[PDB]
Design a protein around this nucleic acid. Structure first.
Ligand SMILES: [Zn+2]
Ligand SMILES: [Zn+2]
Lengths: 147, 83, 98, 94, 72, 109, 83, 61, 109, 94, 83, 97
DNA sequence: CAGCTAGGATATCACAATCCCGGTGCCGAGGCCGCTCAATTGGTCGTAGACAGCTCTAGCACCGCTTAAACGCACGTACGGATTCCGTACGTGCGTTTAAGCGGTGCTAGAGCTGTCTACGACCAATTGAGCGGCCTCGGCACCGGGATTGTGATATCCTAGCTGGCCAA
DNA sequence: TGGCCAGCTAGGATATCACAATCCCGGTGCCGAGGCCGCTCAATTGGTCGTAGACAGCTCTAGCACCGCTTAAACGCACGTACGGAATCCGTACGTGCGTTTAAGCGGTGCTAGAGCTGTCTACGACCAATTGAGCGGCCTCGGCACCGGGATTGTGATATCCTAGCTGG
């Protein structure tokens, strides 16, 4: 039963809310959650607010959750489907971490994309070749959709 | 469903004596029988474990002669006379 | 007068007897019961071919005879004629079974 | 200029995963390479024999499970099978 | 050779051991000082038993013909 | 555009080369054809065995207050663990030595 | 030692399942978790320690053969003060 | 109607494209919509002439 | 209508089936391709070994005044010959018995 | 109705060429078949490993000579090699 | 091209004694120094006669490490650290 | 002067040699023995130093194992002195003769 | 019958060997670097075997009857082990004798890599006769009851040694 | 009264006889080895076609040879102790045989699980062409560890203090 752990994590999140990000269930289903994050400061995505989706598999905290973007964004390590290529979601999963750390890591990857293992080859090419162009395009798309 | 146990005493003291006599043993101590029970049980456990694995790899409920032959052959005690 | 042989004299004759015959020396029915009892611990309601049970007995008896030869050699090496459980242990340990 | 292959890189990576701050001598690395090759040959040979016995023509994970069960003793075999099935499950999940 | 009784007494007198002479010491002495036949070891064993039962020899160590003996 | 190259080892979260294992299997004349999951399973098993050996070897090395693993440490790790000892009972390790043991009869008393 | 001789509920609860410790198993990294959470997370993800990434495979195989996994002392202490 | 995927049955009438079916699959199970494919996006069920109780199959991820 | 069929065993003047051995080699996953003389050599070797064992077993049978070779005779033939005994030292023969011998210490004297 | 193969016919032919007036039990024939299969597998396994070691891909009589030399001990190996070479020579003659 | 047979005496009494010391032997009788060097040459003959035929099959003139490793492997004496 | 009673130096040698991993046989005479043995199978053969080292490692390990078995046999015979009877018994039991 | 002397064990003292610790140089562990070859991806084709349906082998259960084998108890021989005891084959520790080890330069067999090409083996269809199972039967041998040879054990007889008694001599 | 010789008794060893076990023999009856048959499937036949490897030509690695100092290891020897083995003695464990108890084996019957074989269809892996970065050797440098000298701790061997029983002398 993952319900006890999910409820405890939600209770702790309510006890210690984050600063720029926010999440929680958007219904009676504790397995399906929506996460709302703001563009980190000094980033091209700054100003826009991104909404995320969560689907908890029925083994938490011993399996990573199904989390992706519901907000269109311009990031190499993120596909057009909103999926996120992150180790704590794929390999670095551990039952001893909190969702807030996951969101902070997501924001860090937004500030620090990894072109070594991207999800869109063109965005990684732009990020490696023209950092200013990536910063412009990410800001433009943040204004277009995340704003 | 026909659970049985305590079959190790089926290897009777005269049977162990007959085996030792073929081995060329003249006089036998009284403590040989229990330790022979133990040794035989260990050997049979090690062989049947591989035989059953061979059978259940082929997905059938019947332990055949070839499975036992392979289980013995992989333990360095090849046995002839069973194909 | 009750005629009795000296101890060991019939042991030698039965050694000659059993080293000439090739029959199985263990009783087949209890041996099969033992084999099934052991196999209970790996898969339940297993079925055995009679040839498979015979092969298991044929291997086990040969292994025990081979073990007894070496454990008799060890007892002789210790300058005595009665094999004792320490001899079996020594033989198995030298052969690398333990 | 014949390029030869070994498992030194992967052995070193696993060593860094287990003990983050321990080195390994060059001669010990060769011993690890020999060990890896020996175990690989044992398992592959056992799987080939299983496939030939069962009149198959393909070596799948089903054969390798049985080969590991035969070769490795007891709890080591249990853990090895647990590790192998988990990796196959993750590989098929993607 | 003289009687095995006298050879045993002579052996114990020759070997001035604090414990007396052992059966083995007596056996060695008799074989080196007298022309004895192959049966010497059996005759010494029998004679020691007799001399202990007659009280000519006192046992200091062991039991029966095994051990060490002194003249009473 | 085709795709980015992700290694099968990274797919399975392994360290040993799944592709290399597959090549060795299908070039070793072991069977006519090779299944897809067989190299994945085999690489995981090999990685587990190597990790199991290395943990004990590193523990032995640190018990000897050294930071590099030498074959003496491998021998000490193998011959102490019962499972690995039985797995590698017929294997000689160069520069390995033996496990220090003396029969209690020979000790002075 | 767990700590302690009186493990107040906050410590007497599992570090993962957060329920009362049922047959707790002390890891070589001195971490304490219940038998269910342990027997799940062992073969569940990576055989590692969820807390400090410690490998436990050698310790686990050492203790499984001898059935020395369950911390008898703390498991008895919990029964004295907790259900 | 009924729709089979090779498994959560059943799904939309012959009125929703592949994208909506994938979105509902993700909502009902958590499997990503785009991961991995549909074997039998902008295509529909009638475009492939998919009848009721048809057996579907559901890489990039 | 091409030519009369002659078996390769007849070409080599052997008895064991060269064709069957050749088929077994290439269907045995031993190598990618099989040389032409390999089945011939292998069949010759097997025929020679069988001839040796049968000669010894027949001698053992006629020493026992019988006409049909039984596993006891094969065991007696194998254990007496040093070469075959070392060759098949790890082989158990069903219904074979043991070679009759008693250690000289046990004999009465 | 599976057609299974053995070496019984050839064993009987050799037995009649050696002892023309000697019978063989059914169980003894099975033992001979098991022995033949065991030796065949030993030799083939040795030859395959030799071919792999020497970076070849064809098993020829040259590998089988060495496999026999490795497996059979002493005088038996010498006689077997002498027998095999003669048969190969005769086969290559025609 | 002139090696005599005296090299068997190269394995000296102190060398055999320290080998036994590593093996755990307390004291050694004088007849062992001949029995052991009798055994050692028998062992070496068996291994070398298999290494040299490997080299012959490879049509080489020198005996490589892999030849010795294979010869040991086929005797159930696998050796690590040389390939 | 000073004099260790017999046995103690042997025990300290046992402890010393069971802790080290060096090769206990002199390299040059071992090489000469190897070349002498191999000189009958084929003449004018050549050897890699790695091959000779492999042979020496295997031989030393085999001898150490043989001594380990032969010590247990002698102890079983209620002695502390190894003698060739023990070597013969160990070789016979291990199926080498 | 008592004190003194010889044989014993326990505690304390001295010497030697395995140890350990902080300094010092030396080479291989381990890291980066850039090229390249083996792994990967994307695509075609055919076939291994997963599965479903059907057959009939042989594995299982169960029962009564015969009898040989297993069991357990009585009894005493010969074996294992506990004890003494004696001789030298072992270990220990000197000094003198030797060839292993090292770093050295010099000399090249032969290992090992490439690039050519053709003799050899894979792969194939069409041809057919060796090898298979089915069927049948009788001579080989398992099994039994009658009479024989070899080995072991027990008993009896003969010979040798020991002890006691008697006679003779001092 | 003591010593020596002779006779008688007791014990031990050797030889012979008897008893039992395995053995050797035809008789007799059951059934599996082995042969005849005819159908079938695996081996043979002849042709294409591709690549493994032999054979040649070149490159340079590692195997090898003689050389001369500097030790540490081998050797040969003196000495004596603890270990091996031979010799004897005692108690009981393990062999033998018997009567009673137990269940294996036999063979005869009745039941179905599941082994093993067929056919259908497709998911999966071989294979090829194109592509790309993981893994290789080459290069470098520096910290982990081997080597060593100068003090410390533990173990083994030896001596001195306290304890018992036996013998000679008073
Ligand atoms: Zn828990
Ligand atoms: Zn931890």
């Amino acid at each position: 039963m993952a319900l006890k752990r999910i409820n405890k994590e939600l209770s702790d999140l309510a006890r210690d809310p984050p600063a720029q990000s926010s999440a929680g269930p958007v219904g009676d289903d504790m397995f399906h959650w929506q996460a709302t994050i703001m563009g980190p400061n000094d980033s091209p995505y700054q100003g826009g607010v991104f909404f995320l989706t969560i689907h908890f598999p029925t083994d938490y905290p011993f399996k990573p959750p199904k989390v992706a973007f519901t907000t269109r964004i311009y990031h190499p390590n993120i596909n057009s489907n909103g999926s996120i290529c992150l180790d704590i979601l794929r390999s670095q999963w551990s039952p001893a971490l909190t969702i807030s750390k996951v969101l902070l890591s997501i924001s860090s990857l937004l500030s620090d994309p990894n072109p070594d293992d991207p999800l869109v080859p063109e965005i990684a090419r732009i990020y490696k070749t023209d950092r200013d162009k990536y910063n412009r395009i990410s800001r433009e798309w943040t204004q277009k959709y995340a704003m | 469903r026909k659970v049985l146990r305590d079959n190790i005493q089926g290897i009777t003291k005269p049977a162990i004596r007959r085996l030792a006599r073929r081995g060329g043993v003249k006089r036998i101590s009284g403590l040989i029988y229990e330790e022979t029970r133990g040794v035989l049980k260990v050997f049979l456990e090690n062989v049947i474990r591989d035989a059953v694995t061979y059978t259940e790899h082929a997905k059938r409920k019947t332990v055949t002669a070839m499975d036992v032959v392979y289980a013995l052959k992989r333990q360095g005690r090849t046995l002839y006379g069973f194909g | 007068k009750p005629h009795r042989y000296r101890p060991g004299t019939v042991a030698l004759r039965e050694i000659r007897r059993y080293q000439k015959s090739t029959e199985l020396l263990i009783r087949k029915l209890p041996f099969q019961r033992l084999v099934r009892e052991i196999a209970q611990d790996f898969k339940t309601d297993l079925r055995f071919q009679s040839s498979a049970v015979m092969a298991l007995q044929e291997a086990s008896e040969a292994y025990l005879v081979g073990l007894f030869e070496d454990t008799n050699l060890s007892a002789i090496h210790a300058k005595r004629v009665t094999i004792m459980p320490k001899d079996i242990q020594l033989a198995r340990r030298i052969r690398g079974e333990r | 200029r014949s390029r030869k292959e070994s498992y030194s890189v992967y052995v070193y990576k696993v060593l860094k995963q287990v003990h983050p701050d321990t080195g390994i001598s060059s001669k010990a690395m060769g011993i690890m390479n020999s060990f890896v090759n020996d175990i690989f040959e044992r398992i592959a040979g056992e799987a080939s024999r299983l496939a030939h016995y069962n009149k198959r023509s393909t070596i799948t994970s089903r054969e390798i499970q049985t080969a590991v069960r035969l070769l490795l003793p007891g709890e080591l075999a249990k853990h090895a099978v647990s590790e192998g099935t988990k990796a196959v499950t993750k590989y098929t999940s993607a | 050779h003289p009687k095995y009784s006298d050879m045993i007494v002579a052996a114990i007198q020759a070997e001035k051991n604090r414990a007396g002479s052992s059966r083995q010491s007596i056996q060695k002495y008799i074989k080196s000082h007298y022309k004895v036949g192959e049966n010497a070891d059996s005759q010494i064993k029998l004679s020691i038993k007799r001399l202990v039962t007659t009280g000519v020899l006192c046992q200091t160590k062991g039991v029966g013909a095994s051990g060490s003996f002194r003249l009473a | 555009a085709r795709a980015k190259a992700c290694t099968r080892s990274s797919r399975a979260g392994l360290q040993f080369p799944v592709g290399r294992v597959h090549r060795l299997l299908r070039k070793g004349n072991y069977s006519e054809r090779v299944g897809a999951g067989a190299p994945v399973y085999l690489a995981a098993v090999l990685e587990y065995l190597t990790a199991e050996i290395l943990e004990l070897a590193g523990n032995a090395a640190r018990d000897n207050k050294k930071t590099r693993i030498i074959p003496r440490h491998l021998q000490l790790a193998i011959r102490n663990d019962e499972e690995l000892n039985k797995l590698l009972g017929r294997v000689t390790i160069a520069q390995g030595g033996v496990l220090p043991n003396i029969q209690a009869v020979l000790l002075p008393k | 030692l767990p700590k302690d001789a009186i493990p107040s509920l906050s410590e007497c609860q599992c570090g993962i399942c957060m329920e009362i410790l049922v047959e707790p198993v002390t890891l070589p990294c001195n971490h304490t978790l219940c038998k269910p959470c342990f027997q799940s997370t062992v073969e569940k993800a990576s055989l590692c320690c969820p807390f400090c990434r410690r490998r436990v495979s050698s310790w686990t195989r050492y203790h499984t053969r001898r059935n020395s996994l369950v911390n008898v002392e703390l498991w008895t202490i919990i029964q004295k003060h907790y259900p | 109607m009924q729709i089979f995927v090779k498994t959560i049955t059943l799904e939309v009438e012959p009125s929703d494209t592949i994208e909506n079916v994938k979105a509902k699959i993700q909502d009902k199970e958590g499997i990503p919509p785009d991961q991995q494919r549909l074997i039998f996006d902008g295509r529909t069920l009638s475009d492939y002439n998919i009848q009721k109780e048809s057996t579907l199959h559901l890489l990039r991820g």
